[PDB]
Design a protein around this ligand. Sequence first.
Ligand SMILES: [Cu+2]
Ligand SMILES: [Hg+2]
Ligand SMILES: [Hg+2]
Ligand SMILES: [Hg+2]
Ligand SMILES: [Hg+2]
Length: 307
Amino acid sequence: ARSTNTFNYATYHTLDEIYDFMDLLVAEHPQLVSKLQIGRSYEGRPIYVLKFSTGGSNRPAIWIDLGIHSREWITQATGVWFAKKFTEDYGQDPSFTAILDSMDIFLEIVTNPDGFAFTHSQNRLWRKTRSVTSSSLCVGVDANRNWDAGFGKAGASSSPCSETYHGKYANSEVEVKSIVDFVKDHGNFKAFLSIHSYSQLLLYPYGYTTQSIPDKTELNQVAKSAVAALKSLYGTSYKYGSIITTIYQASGGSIDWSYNQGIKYSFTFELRDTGRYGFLLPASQIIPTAQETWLGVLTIMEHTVNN
Ligand SMILES: [Cu+2]
Ligand SMILES: [Hg+2]
Ligand SMILES: [Hg+2]
Ligand SMILES: [Hg+2]
Ligand SMILES: [Hg+2]
């Protein structure tokens, strides 16, 4: 509220409160975090990424996005918890400290701000962007079907009213283009994590093709390790594997894109729960979710630093 220390992390918040939170954080930790705007949403809301760094120029970096599917509120809540945690742990946690001493971390807490507002205003379950058009009264695109990785293949719908509509062409949604251009311009990303809910899964590419990635042994070992760390705190059980073998065929997904850009450590997390509450996870599960996900994420970052 008046300081990140008084912000209530154990409750869900609106867009404005999250945006306010970002400014407070930057104000409190100017030497570590900065707020960059990498685009504007369809309805004109700024799209912000927090950059965490101890210096250097173009250091290898880690991208983390949350909330691309707006109704997955647990994700934006986890994103705010992570932002705070980074600032607390630097200097206290040996491992994390080593990570930030050598790499920068870019965190996008609200990747789909128009959808997020819509979830507070009109439809709690809204998943897509809010882009409109012409040959349909249906609004919106599945931003996780809009990337240029098997765009348009099986695993996405071409019907505008579908929950999985892929949109007119790859990267047609501003919310996606913005990340694409930012990552391509930076050119030094080593890891790309996209956070979703629900199902308790840790996935690696690909989703659009049965073809195995060349780094499959390593990512799989990574995922296994991360899942082991994550389970350690509360016993939360995750499965892991490639998107297509674990879930279903899905095209135009972000991690397929990042992996094809050469960002080896590309993974998607599907947070709690397994169906009991689904998207409507109680506020009381915020903190435990966030704490256990951190362990998983930290294990991937460690791997990254050392490889
Ligand atoms: Cu899923
Ligand atoms: Hg600080
Ligand atoms: Hg702080
Ligand atoms: Hg999702
Ligand atoms: Hg805490």
